[PDB]
């Protein structure tokens, strides 16, 4: 968008891993081109060079500077904005800003899951978690009488049908259970477009649970459920029909990046799926219960992009005024201040690192920016990029360590923001969120209502609002393992133009909201598609992976290489912001 201030959050259209962000990376990864910089002069010298400008890389710079207050630090990032998966999206509607989150969504169970170091970072940045108990408008949608709904599609169920009053409790649920505005299981499932037989079988799944593994010991049941997909468990042990289990296919797409065919039944049990109540399995532990019980309210209006923005402002005060969690939300960021010469911390966007080599007690780093190669030097280096990227960069890796890094196959996801002129159609249909079992977008919702800083969430159904929807390009029921579904999902996204992505959005919104007078051409006033082709870190999947071999690969992959330490959430095989922070802390301590 030339002619305006350099300001990525205001961009709409094809975002996430946008055109321009990945082309050099694919020249290495797909064509095996090597970009050597050993014959170029060193242009700049730092104490620390960080490859990758997501939460992990920014946390690496932050904890390094805490240990080394005078440190000169360069962060090299290939997207056009900092933050990695944590991106701020903006819309202009009716003279005001509407904020959305491009990716990394909320702080997950922070009281239970965030380490003392991560809590220390939040404290120093001015984030008081208790503020979200009032910032998050928990009773807003429930108090309007709205509920969650399931949209059955004609292609999979014979008819389009929206069924509201869903009582399903979700893993990370922002709605109190007594505020779901839901119906009984019998009344809810009674409206499903399924045969009477299938409807009775689903209702009995809730009303009359049975020990589908009768005879087995608890240990044998746990082993079986770790090795059996949720879908197969429902088919073979519960006995639901192939059409019945379709209702469950996409429910796990968002939180696991795969469908029920690739979800271990044991993981479905931990996530609160039905069918386990009479198996006699142990109740979840203290940690599992304290984590599951925390309200899912720790949501800045732009998601975890606020964490990245807080860190950038703390590292480079010239970029934006202010301090603390309230004024960050509408703070104005000046991107021309990110990379100023002589300044101790510099964040260099649109730059793909291509080479990392230990030399003479320091680290030489090559990168490509605007098609030209550059060479810089640090005493230390943190690889905070995608771990499968590291073997193409770090020239000092053993064959074994390079292979281990390559086994972290990340999952693709698409987080789409849609600006609507109004949300009367949602009010008329009595809904604030829709689950679609088989369609591309499995989750479609009015955005979380959060008031923070000077930002107020949209309130008036006659006025504009942001919608969030999740599309995961799974290939269900094909016999693929998880790594293959992930790679194939990326191939599917690579083949799709923005025009094809927009058609899927407009088609599905029109089919679901149209009966209430929605007109996609008239009522959609903005679309931002955050394409996270390399989204969640891989995670150990008991359907396909051996735990002992997987933990060994993970630990080998993140082994320090001279003065080069390895971070990113990938290094934990754990797709969370607190893992991104903790892996950076480990890497900084190693140096
Ligand atoms: C759609 C989505 C939703 C999520 N929601 C949540 C949530 O609610 N809660 C939660 O805790 N976590 C969530 N996450 C997990 C998320 O991965 C982490 O929260 C965190 O954002 C990851 O930070 P990171 O630094 O580990 O990785 P990233 O954010 O991916 O940062 C790595 C960066 O390195 C860059 N890079 C790669 N190669 C190079 C190179 N050669 N040179 C330079 N830079 C390079 C990448 O382009 C990227 O920008 C979500 C993730 C996704 C994809
Ligand atoms: C910051 C953005 C990106 C980076 C750094 C990046 C980097 C890479 C690398 C290094 C590989 C090789 C993996 C290996 O050999 O182990 C790869 C694979 C691949 N990428 Fe990307 N890529 C990016 C964005 C994208 C986008 C936007 C798409 C599609 C729209 C895409 C599609 C694919 C596909 C299909 C593969 C092959 C399957 C796989 O091995 O995962 N990538 N990417």
XYZ file of C-alpha atoms and ligand atoms in Angstrom:
687
model
C 0.000 0.000 0.000
C 2.394 2.730 -1.182
C 1.616 6.373 -0.552
C 0.612 5.936 3.081
C 2.470 5.450 6.315
C 4.144 2.066 6.538
C 1.437 0.449 8.671
C 0.665 -3.277 8.133
C -2.219 -3.605 10.645
C -4.436 -1.417 8.486
C -4.014 -3.719 5.466
C -6.925 -5.953 4.479
C -7.039 -8.705 1.877
C -4.497 -11.548 1.728
C -2.543 -11.350 4.984
C -0.902 -13.769 7.409
C 1.987 -15.193 5.408
C 1.406 -12.633 2.662
C 2.922 -12.431 -0.825
C 6.522 -11.287 -0.404
C 7.048 -12.998 2.960
C 7.997 -16.495 1.795
C 9.548 -16.345 -1.685
C 13.191 -16.450 -0.579
C 12.327 -19.110 2.016
C 10.818 -21.268 -0.738
C 13.792 -20.738 -3.043
C 15.768 -22.510 -0.316
C 13.122 -24.980 0.814
C 11.653 -25.949 -2.558
C 14.429 -25.299 -5.094
C 17.402 -25.914 -2.742
C 19.071 -22.685 -3.761
C 21.814 -21.638 -1.364
C 22.506 -17.965 -0.650
C 26.071 -17.734 0.619
C 27.268 -14.410 2.020
C 30.791 -15.513 2.981
C 32.252 -13.261 0.285
C 30.447 -10.089 1.409
C 31.806 -7.640 3.990
C 30.245 -7.575 7.434
C 28.027 -4.488 7.470
C 26.961 -4.357 11.135
C 27.947 -5.904 14.476
C 25.689 -6.753 17.409
C 25.851 -8.580 20.701
C 22.829 -10.695 19.720
C 21.226 -11.447 16.342
C 17.734 -12.965 16.528
C 16.339 -14.763 13.480
C 12.550 -14.471 13.571
C 10.401 -11.671 14.964
C 7.506 -13.504 16.589
C 6.814 -13.663 20.309
C 9.715 -16.071 20.801
C 12.253 -13.864 19.030
C 11.024 -10.705 20.748
C 11.140 -12.473 24.123
C 14.689 -13.625 23.325
C 15.734 -10.011 22.709
C 13.900 -8.887 25.857
C 15.377 -11.468 28.230
C 18.816 -11.031 26.668
C 18.635 -7.276 27.313
C 17.523 -7.862 30.906
C 20.653 -9.956 31.444
C 22.810 -7.603 29.316
C 21.368 -4.084 29.659
C 23.794 -2.468 27.166
C 23.366 -5.181 24.525
C 23.040 -4.288 20.852
C 20.389 -6.560 19.353
C 19.154 -7.094 15.788
C 15.903 -8.953 15.071
C 15.548 -10.187 11.465
C 11.955 -10.912 10.400
C 10.662 -11.931 6.964
C 7.014 -10.759 7.148
C 6.105 -7.103 6.636
C 5.047 -6.736 10.300
C 6.544 -7.998 13.532
C 4.799 -10.540 15.731
C 4.805 -13.771 13.716
C 1.451 -15.470 14.329
C 0.530 -12.573 16.656
C -0.715 -9.883 14.270
C -3.021 -6.890 14.687
C -5.775 -6.437 12.085
C -7.768 -3.231 11.721
C -10.959 -2.141 9.995
C -12.362 1.363 9.600
C -16.148 1.457 9.922
C -18.384 4.403 10.725
C -15.573 6.725 11.765
C -14.083 4.309 14.325
C -11.517 1.521 14.391
C -12.575 -2.104 14.805
C -9.710 -4.333 15.993
C -9.190 -8.010 15.263
C -6.539 -10.650 15.839
C -4.691 -12.041 12.844
C -3.642 -15.247 14.568
C -2.404 -15.964 18.094
C -5.682 -15.464 19.899
C -5.579 -15.328 23.720
C -3.445 -16.044 26.759
C -4.302 -19.666 27.543
C -5.018 -20.456 31.234
C -2.235 -18.073 32.269
C -2.579 -18.550 36.029
C -1.928 -22.296 35.593
C 0.270 -22.503 32.479
C 2.506 -19.410 32.464
C 5.941 -19.926 34.001
C 7.412 -17.565 36.570
C 9.571 -16.079 33.805
C 6.553 -15.518 31.550
C 4.643 -13.993 34.472
C 7.706 -11.833 35.194
C 7.613 -10.605 31.585
C 3.886 -9.815 31.810
C 4.493 -7.920 35.063
C 7.348 -5.851 33.632
C 5.235 -5.031 30.563
C 2.371 -3.798 32.724
C -0.035 -6.672 32.055
C -2.258 -7.317 35.071
C -4.229 -10.489 34.312
C -7.045 -9.580 36.719
C -7.907 -6.606 34.484
C -9.495 -9.028 32.009
C -12.119 -10.001 34.597
C -13.699 -6.627 33.810
C -12.306 -5.902 30.325
C -13.869 -9.077 28.878
C -17.633 -8.435 28.593
C -18.512 -11.997 29.554
C -22.288 -11.568 29.754
C -22.702 -9.375 26.662
C -23.810 -11.964 24.085
C -25.516 -14.269 26.638
C -27.447 -11.319 28.085
C -28.761 -10.557 24.609
C -30.237 -14.065 24.591
C -27.717 -15.375 22.062
C -26.501 -18.983 21.906
C -24.184 -21.137 19.840
C -25.385 -23.033 16.782
C -24.442 -25.838 14.415
C -24.761 -25.424 10.664
C -25.387 -28.612 8.703
C -24.563 -28.348 4.999
C -26.623 -29.718 2.111
C -23.684 -31.644 0.634
C -23.073 -33.727 3.780
C -26.565 -33.924 5.323
C -28.954 -33.412 2.399
C -30.173 -29.977 3.524
C -28.792 -26.699 4.857
C -29.961 -26.299 8.452
C -28.951 -24.001 11.310
C -29.647 -25.453 14.774
C -29.178 -23.163 17.776
C -29.052 -23.730 21.517
C -25.958 -25.950 21.409
C -25.045 -27.037 24.982
C -21.594 -28.332 23.971
C -18.945 -27.035 26.406
C -15.789 -26.056 24.567
C -12.178 -26.664 25.632
C -11.313 -22.966 26.011
C -14.765 -21.505 26.643
C -15.391 -17.812 27.295
C -19.095 -18.425 28.080
C -19.999 -19.605 31.609
C -21.792 -22.944 31.370
C -24.985 -21.585 32.992
C -24.991 -18.779 30.372
C -24.976 -20.957 27.236
C -28.679 -20.222 26.499
C -28.749 -23.836 25.351
C -31.394 -26.522 25.008
C -31.432 -30.066 26.324
C -29.494 -32.651 24.347
C -32.756 -34.316 23.330
C -34.290 -31.071 22.073
C -31.059 -29.916 20.405
C -30.181 -33.180 18.622
C -33.876 -33.632 17.805
C -33.484 -30.814 15.264
C -30.468 -32.393 13.544
C -31.015 -33.279 9.844
C -30.332 -36.956 10.546
C -32.438 -40.103 10.482
C -34.564 -40.782 13.549
C -32.263 -43.713 14.306
C -29.120 -41.573 14.099
C -30.753 -38.891 16.250
C -31.654 -41.426 18.951
C -28.115 -42.827 18.913
C -26.598 -39.356 19.397
C -29.085 -38.535 22.149
C -28.202 -41.800 23.900
C -24.528 -40.862 23.606
C -25.383 -38.102 26.114
C -28.318 -39.513 28.099
C -27.222 -43.162 28.454
C -23.416 -43.504 28.420
C -22.116 -47.068 28.526
C -18.741 -48.716 29.069
C -17.889 -49.169 25.384
C -14.609 -50.842 26.439
C -16.116 -53.116 29.104
C -13.703 -55.710 30.435
C -10.507 -53.779 29.773
C -8.421 -52.470 32.640
C -8.039 -48.719 32.973
C -4.505 -49.096 31.607
C -5.746 -51.083 28.599
C -8.446 -48.457 28.000
C -5.909 -45.606 28.101
C -3.593 -47.457 25.684
C -6.476 -48.190 23.319
C -7.741 -44.596 23.355
C -4.232 -43.224 22.695
C -3.908 -45.432 19.588
C -7.485 -45.034 18.256
C -8.856 -41.891 16.618
C -11.956 -40.294 18.087
C -13.767 -40.971 14.812
C -12.909 -44.686 14.858
C -13.822 -44.902 18.557
C -17.277 -43.529 17.740
C -17.609 -45.823 14.704
C -16.243 -49.069 16.144
C -16.873 -48.851 19.893
C -19.853 -46.520 20.344
C -21.425 -47.693 17.089
C -22.546 -44.409 15.558
C -23.203 -44.326 11.848
C -20.861 -42.739 9.330
C -23.401 -39.952 8.860
C -23.693 -39.463 12.640
C -19.968 -39.062 13.189
C -19.859 -36.363 10.500
C -21.373 -34.113 13.178
C -18.052 -34.397 15.081
C -15.668 -34.142 12.109
C -14.615 -30.499 12.304
C -15.147 -29.704 15.989
C -11.414 -30.186 16.705
C -10.122 -28.317 13.604
C -9.365 -25.067 15.441
C -7.831 -26.292 18.671
C -5.866 -29.207 17.154
C -5.537 -28.163 13.458
C -7.001 -31.561 12.461
C -10.369 -33.286 12.405
C -11.792 -36.144 14.443
C -10.100 -38.706 12.163
C -6.673 -37.482 13.316
C -7.545 -36.772 16.969
C -6.539 -39.489 19.464
C -9.634 -40.531 21.362
C -7.666 -39.901 24.585
C -7.141 -36.299 23.443
C -10.847 -35.998 22.651
C -11.557 -37.162 26.214
C -9.224 -34.517 27.658
C -10.915 -31.875 25.484
C -14.360 -32.752 26.850
C -15.822 -34.668 23.893
C -18.721 -37.050 24.655
C -18.612 -40.837 24.844
C -16.275 -41.396 27.815
C -18.409 -40.773 30.930
C -19.017 -44.454 31.734
C -15.540 -45.821 30.919
C -14.263 -45.365 34.467
C -11.237 -43.366 33.337
C -9.443 -41.316 36.005
C -10.617 -37.766 36.470
C -8.080 -35.289 35.051
C -5.266 -34.334 37.448
C -4.986 -31.049 39.377
C -3.060 -29.355 36.568
C -5.518 -30.540 33.918
C -8.498 -29.461 36.045
C -7.070 -26.047 37.001
C -6.177 -25.344 33.361
C -9.589 -26.403 31.974
C -11.438 -24.403 34.661
C -9.842 -21.013 33.944
C -12.124 -18.561 32.108
C -11.035 -17.964 28.509
C -11.104 -14.191 28.970
C -7.449 -13.154 28.579
C -7.998 -11.537 25.213
C -6.674 -8.200 24.030
C -8.802 -6.686 21.212
C -6.063 -7.615 18.719
C -5.295 -10.898 20.447
C -1.738 -11.729 21.405
C -0.505 -9.080 18.972
C -0.715 -6.870 22.068
C 2.013 -8.990 23.670
C 4.231 -8.484 20.624
C 3.385 -4.764 20.540
C 4.094 -4.378 24.272
C 7.493 -5.996 23.839
C 8.420 -3.980 20.766
C 7.492 -0.723 22.515
C 9.493 -1.747 25.594
C 12.510 -2.745 23.467
C 12.355 0.279 21.139
C 10.613 3.154 22.976
C 10.846 5.438 19.922
C 8.190 3.371 18.096
C 5.232 4.365 20.273
C 4.474 6.395 23.404
C 3.069 5.073 26.634
C 3.492 2.273 29.137
C 1.254 -0.560 30.307
C -1.599 -2.677 29.032
C -4.300 -0.025 28.650
C -2.639 2.471 26.328
C -1.017 -0.174 24.086
C -4.409 -1.027 22.556
C -4.770 2.204 20.600
C -1.125 3.256 20.707
C 0.107 4.551 17.367
C 3.158 2.627 16.148
C 5.703 4.427 13.950
C 7.322 1.704 11.861
C 10.069 4.067 10.633
C 11.594 3.909 14.156
C 12.046 0.128 14.211
C 15.484 -0.123 12.570
C 17.475 3.056 13.268
C 21.260 2.914 12.988
C 23.231 3.066 16.212
C 20.089 2.400 18.262
C 20.712 -0.527 20.614
C 17.702 -2.659 19.509
C 16.761 -2.860 15.839
C 13.892 -4.800 14.239
C 14.426 -5.362 10.509
C 11.294 -6.397 8.606
C 10.884 -7.925 5.133
C 14.174 -9.762 5.662
C 14.796 -13.505 5.203
C 17.831 -14.933 6.977
C 19.614 -17.295 4.605
C 22.841 -18.208 6.400
C 24.065 -18.656 9.992
C 27.618 -19.767 10.795
C 29.771 -19.893 13.932
C 33.089 -18.100 13.357
C 35.809 -16.667 15.618
C 33.759 -16.786 18.819
C 30.813 -15.059 17.137
C 28.061 -15.722 14.572
C 27.901 -14.426 10.986
C 24.339 -14.052 9.680
C 23.290 -13.559 6.068
C 19.875 -12.312 5.020
C 18.036 -11.223 1.893
C 16.051 -7.975 1.756
C 14.440 -6.622 -1.429
C 16.294 -9.289 -3.388
C 19.751 -8.261 -2.126
C 22.040 -10.154 0.237
C 23.514 -8.671 3.413
C 25.920 -9.922 6.069
C 25.948 -8.990 9.776
C 27.645 -10.372 12.874
C 26.710 -11.090 16.453
C 28.516 -12.524 19.428
C 25.442 -14.720 19.987
C 22.475 -15.771 17.862
C 19.007 -17.116 18.668
C 17.125 -19.043 15.968
C 13.575 -17.973 16.810
C 12.193 -18.864 13.374
C 10.232 -21.933 12.318
C 12.340 -24.889 13.313
C 12.039 -26.675 9.946
C 13.604 -23.502 8.478
C 16.758 -23.869 10.628
C 18.525 -26.573 8.533
C 18.487 -24.269 5.479
C 20.186 -21.507 7.513
C 22.455 -22.962 10.190
C 25.475 -24.286 8.288
C 27.016 -25.961 11.370
C 24.275 -28.539 12.039
C 25.011 -32.241 12.058
C 22.948 -34.377 9.693
C 21.157 -35.844 12.712
C 20.210 -32.487 14.211
C 19.091 -31.125 10.836
C 16.856 -34.167 10.361
C 15.324 -33.690 13.822
C 14.484 -30.039 13.124
C 12.817 -31.044 9.844
C 10.425 -33.358 11.701
C 8.556 -30.383 13.188
C 5.977 -30.182 10.413
C 3.767 -27.218 11.233
C 0.010 -27.151 10.671
C -1.708 -24.723 8.282
C -4.656 -22.625 9.477
C -6.572 -19.657 8.094
C -7.971 -16.999 10.458
C -10.353 -14.728 8.562
C -11.749 -11.390 9.758
C -14.961 -10.160 8.165
C -16.361 -6.672 8.690
C -20.171 -6.665 8.602
C -22.298 -3.524 8.075
C -24.497 -4.673 10.967
C -25.274 -7.883 12.804
C -29.071 -7.871 12.747
C -29.025 -11.262 10.992
C -27.180 -12.739 13.982
C -29.629 -11.182 16.451
C -32.569 -12.475 14.406
C -31.129 -16.002 14.349
C -30.384 -15.794 18.094
C -26.709 -16.707 17.685
C -23.228 -15.373 18.372
C -21.202 -18.390 17.159
C -21.637 -21.169 14.583
C -19.953 -24.576 14.320
C -20.007 -26.089 10.817
C -19.124 -29.817 10.959
C -17.912 -30.295 7.388
C -17.596 -26.905 5.655
C -14.242 -25.137 5.074
C -14.927 -22.651 7.896
C -15.614 -24.779 10.973
C -15.967 -21.848 13.414
C -17.730 -18.541 12.662
C -18.453 -16.056 15.449
C -19.080 -12.484 16.415
C -15.761 -11.373 17.867
C -15.064 -11.495 21.588
C -16.494 -8.352 23.241
C -13.550 -6.737 25.017
C -13.256 -3.156 26.283
C -9.667 -2.174 26.995
C -7.882 1.132 27.011
C -9.785 3.628 24.880
C -11.222 0.778 22.775
C -14.865 -0.245 23.146
C -16.304 -3.366 21.579
C -19.163 -2.892 19.086
C -22.502 -3.095 20.898
C -25.313 -2.013 18.538
C -26.608 -4.690 16.111
C -27.508 -1.890 13.671
C -23.789 -0.860 13.576
C -20.672 -2.623 12.186
C -18.943 -5.505 13.951
C -16.064 -7.872 13.278
C -16.585 -11.584 12.641
C -13.884 -14.208 13.192
C -13.871 -17.451 11.248
C -11.443 -20.401 11.122
C -10.646 -22.487 8.022
C -8.316 -25.470 8.378
C -7.529 -27.267 5.080
C -7.736 -30.815 6.453
C -8.077 -33.954 4.315
C -10.316 -36.067 6.535
C -10.705 -39.834 6.506
C -7.997 -40.348 3.854
C -5.586 -42.565 5.790
C -2.907 -39.840 6.126
C -0.891 -39.263 9.248
C -0.836 -35.797 10.795
C 2.412 -34.624 9.168
C 0.969 -35.503 5.765
C -2.376 -33.762 6.350
C -0.322 -30.700 7.341
C 1.852 -30.759 4.206
C -1.147 -31.483 1.972
C -3.077 -28.684 3.672
C -0.285 -26.283 2.697
C -0.404 -27.563 -0.893
C -4.135 -26.848 -0.969
C -3.585 -23.289 0.323
C -0.767 -22.694 -2.178
C -3.157 -23.551 -5.039
C -5.812 -21.048 -3.922
C -6.049 -17.468 -5.097
C -7.445 -14.751 -2.881
C -10.493 -14.797 -5.180
C -11.097 -18.464 -4.365
C -10.616 -17.765 -0.646
C -13.113 -14.913 -0.807
C -15.663 -17.051 -2.633
C -15.601 -19.658 0.168
C -16.156 -16.898 2.741
C -19.015 -15.249 0.847
C -20.637 -18.583 -0.089
C -20.695 -19.878 3.461
C -21.815 -16.614 5.073
C -24.639 -16.299 2.523
C -25.819 -19.875 3.111
C -25.830 -19.524 6.920
C -27.068 -15.967 7.369
C -29.122 -15.507 4.190
C -32.404 -16.878 5.604
C -32.394 -13.880 7.984
C -32.031 -11.358 5.153
C -28.234 -11.298 4.951
C -26.884 -10.188 1.558
C -23.144 -10.810 1.347
C -22.583 -8.268 -1.433
C -24.321 -5.523 0.554
C -23.466 -6.492 4.132
C -19.766 -7.453 3.998
C -17.649 -4.300 4.108
C -14.217 -5.815 4.730
C -12.266 -9.085 4.510
C -8.820 -9.867 5.944
C -7.582 -13.427 5.380
C -4.667 -14.355 7.650
C -3.129 -17.327 5.817
C -0.962 -19.219 8.331
C 0.491 -21.793 5.972
C 3.007 -22.654 8.704
C 0.784 -22.241 11.761
C 0.817 -24.414 14.898
C 4.045 -26.146 15.832
C 3.854 -29.883 15.319
C 2.792 -31.804 18.422
C 3.307 -35.449 19.375
C 0.277 -37.410 18.102
C -0.149 -40.821 19.741
C -1.999 -42.139 16.659
C 1.194 -41.788 14.598
C 4.159 -41.002 16.841
C 6.139 -42.886 19.455
C 6.475 -40.723 22.556
C 10.050 -41.770 23.402
C 11.381 -41.242 19.873
C 9.467 -37.963 19.600
C 10.826 -36.482 22.825
C 14.323 -37.511 21.714
C 13.947 -35.792 18.328
C 12.593 -32.672 20.054
C 15.510 -32.435 22.451
C 18.086 -33.129 19.751
C 16.549 -30.541 17.420
C 16.884 -27.669 19.928
C 20.472 -28.477 20.995
C 22.706 -25.410 21.068
C 25.181 -25.115 18.170
C 28.230 -23.167 19.324
C 27.057 -19.615 19.981
C 23.721 -20.324 18.235
C 20.756 -21.266 20.407
C 17.420 -22.499 19.108
C 14.048 -21.160 20.240
C 10.514 -20.680 18.820
C 7.429 -22.409 20.214
C 8.400 -25.123 17.692
C 11.314 -26.076 19.951
C 8.768 -27.218 22.563
C 6.510 -28.996 20.021
C 3.853 -26.914 21.764
C 1.816 -24.292 19.893
C 1.416 -21.662 22.624
C 2.618 -18.148 23.395
C 3.931 -19.227 26.800
C 5.995 -21.927 25.086
C 7.332 -19.291 22.692
C 8.374 -17.274 25.744
C 9.830 -20.225 27.677
C 11.858 -21.507 24.730
C 13.349 -18.032 24.276
C 14.204 -17.920 27.985
C 15.984 -21.285 27.728
C 17.902 -20.115 24.650
C 19.013 -16.909 26.359
C 20.131 -18.826 29.466
C 22.131 -21.223 27.260
C 24.094 -18.314 25.757
C -3.985 -19.296 13.928
C -3.204 -19.407 15.214
C -3.833 -19.143 16.432
C -3.138 -19.256 17.643
N -3.796 -18.972 18.843
C -3.087 -19.070 19.975
C -3.747 -18.777 21.239
O -4.915 -18.434 21.383
N -2.926 -18.905 22.346
C -1.593 -19.287 22.333
O -0.984 -19.366 23.407
N -0.988 -19.567 21.141
C -1.710 -19.471 20.031
N -1.089 -19.737 18.833
C 0.296 -20.228 18.871
C 1.336 -19.262 18.339
O 2.201 -20.008 17.474
C 2.098 -18.680 19.528
O 1.152 -18.050 20.383
C 3.134 -17.632 19.140
O 2.469 -16.628 18.374
C 4.261 -18.255 18.348
O 5.425 -17.411 18.425
P 6.804 -17.901 17.854
O 7.783 -16.817 17.993
O 7.113 -19.244 18.508
O 6.556 -18.229 16.315
P 6.091 -17.263 15.146
O 5.046 -16.332 15.646
O 5.689 -18.142 13.983
O 7.385 -16.489 14.782
C 8.397 -17.076 13.935
C 8.720 -16.061 12.868
O 9.984 -16.388 12.233
C 9.841 -16.048 10.877
N 10.880 -16.656 10.051
C 10.842 -17.892 9.457
N 11.871 -18.146 8.685
C 12.622 -16.981 8.747
C 13.836 -16.598 8.139
N 14.543 -17.388 7.325
N 14.305 -15.356 8.404
C 13.607 -14.561 9.216
N 12.455 -14.814 9.844
C 12.009 -16.045 9.561
C 8.435 -16.509 10.532
O 8.022 -15.948 9.294
C 7.680 -15.963 11.742
O 7.300 -14.615 11.495
C -1.787 -19.643 17.613
C -1.164 -19.914 16.400
C -1.858 -19.810 15.203
C -1.144 -20.117 13.909
C 6.861 -16.889 6.358
C 6.330 -17.681 5.440
C 6.969 -19.012 4.973
C 8.159 -19.590 5.240
C 9.332 -19.075 6.109
C 8.188 -20.860 4.523
C 9.219 -21.770 4.514
C 9.125 -23.067 4.072
C 10.192 -24.046 4.046
C 11.642 -23.818 4.506
C 9.702 -25.186 3.555
C 10.488 -26.507 3.340
C 10.191 -27.490 4.476
C 11.240 -28.585 4.590
O 11.944 -28.879 3.589
O 11.376 -29.189 5.692
C 8.299 -24.966 3.245
C 7.427 -25.895 2.719
C 6.202 -25.616 2.148
N 5.535 -24.408 2.162
Fe 6.253 -22.733 3.052
N 6.990 -21.014 3.853
C 6.222 -19.899 4.110
C 4.948 -19.641 3.625
C 4.179 -20.481 2.841
C 2.931 -20.129 2.196
C 2.336 -18.713 2.321
C 2.479 -21.217 1.537
C 1.206 -21.415 0.684
C 0.274 -20.477 0.490
C 3.442 -22.287 1.756
C 3.388 -23.577 1.261
C 4.346 -24.555 1.463
C 4.279 -25.929 1.002
C 3.116 -26.529 0.174
C 5.392 -26.560 1.414
C 5.793 -28.036 1.185
C 5.201 -28.919 2.294
C 6.037 -28.878 3.552
O 7.182 -29.403 3.549
O 5.560 -28.326 4.579
N 4.456 -21.796 2.551
N 7.983 -23.666 3.572
